[PDB]
Amino acid sequence: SKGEELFTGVVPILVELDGDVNGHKFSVSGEGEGDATYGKLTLKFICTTGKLPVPWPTLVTTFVQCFSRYPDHMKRHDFFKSAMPEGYVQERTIFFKDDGNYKTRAEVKFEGDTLVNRIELKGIDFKEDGNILGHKLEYNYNSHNVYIMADKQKNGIKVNFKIRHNIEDGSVQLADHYQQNTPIGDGPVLLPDNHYLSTQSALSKDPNEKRDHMVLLEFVTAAGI
Known about the structure:
Assembly: monomeric
Radius of gyration: 17 Å
Entry title: green fluorescent protein from aequorea victoria
Keywords: beta-barrel, autocatalytic, fluorophore, bioluminescense fluorescent protein, fluorescent protein
Largest sheet: 11 strands, mixed, barrel
PDB class: fluorescent protein
Name: green fluorescent protein
Number of strands: 11
CATH architecture: Beta Barrel
């Protein structure tokens, strides 16, 4: 396919987010690199408007699936890379159990040789005293499976999954994800058979960094075929 060749080495990544959660406005910038050969991502995010109003972990999923490692035998199912360099639109709705929801819209594509993820986030109906606004989530992250399916009507894919956020009291915060991706260009893309992505992520901090930020290491590989 098209994009395949674009991912053959380490690619620099730029992440830009504009958000509003219950009237609290904020901006985030992130930079790093991805190496789809190992399904590996390394990023650092910085809250540019000051203190992040929600917990960092809640934004992970929002902050580039084209960096997933697809095994040789599954290359024909890699929609993400097939949409490059023109890119794709990724939209979601994220429902926090017994809490508010996030609505996101992003464009992911290449600007020169940098892979760009530009997002607009809108959060509503959050409880001022819930796990999100109340900042009760631990600073860590779990492994998940992300289910993918073809959408022949929109020439895209539909994706669904649940994230499990650990709460400081030992409990769990569920986050139901509903997602749609559609190509930006008019060129051909690869529509996949049902399959899934297996994820793992580690969160850390930069000891010498005074701004509000998050350091992220993540591995993702496709499976189920």
